[PDB]
Amino acid sequence: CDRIGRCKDIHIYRLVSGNSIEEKLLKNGTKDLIREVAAQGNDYSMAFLTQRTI
Amino acid sequence: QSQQRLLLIDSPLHNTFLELWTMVHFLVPGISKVVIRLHRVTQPFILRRTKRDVEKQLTKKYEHVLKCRLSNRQKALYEDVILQPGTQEALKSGHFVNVLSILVRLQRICNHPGLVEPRHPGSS
16 A cells, blocks of 8 residues: 555544444554464453553 | 575574584685584675564554344344353363363354354245
8 A cells, every 4th residue: 555655645534433342443453463473262351452442 | 606695584493503503615616612612604605684673664464353243133143152051061061172062162163153053034
């Protein structure tokens, strides 16, 4: 997306639903990588549940 | 047969001096604290720069995050999803990663009720 808009003052707009977990995932999206341990029963991210609730 | 030569490289390796020496030799055929001395030796023939030049160098990028509330249908679907047996799954009851990913996907497609709830005509 940045490559195609390589120059000429490109404008990027992002739509995110308010008061939803989408904002939490946007601000913090590294959880997918932090849990790169063996799949099929990771069972990690205990404290990160606060984002799903809010 | 050429009187001059020009080479383009993205970035060379720090260690493995063999490659650097071979490149310097093939530049011109007239040659037979560690990193500091290596850079000092490569002073006469070197021209490098970093991306710090992009500052005010016509590189103008703009990003605007626009917040948008949910519709009544969206609110209803969200309340329904969060208020379901999945609550226990969200509380890390079993297969935590799987149920979390499933709930995230559901809430993601819930950004438009027409996707999960396809409005259809009321035929008679």
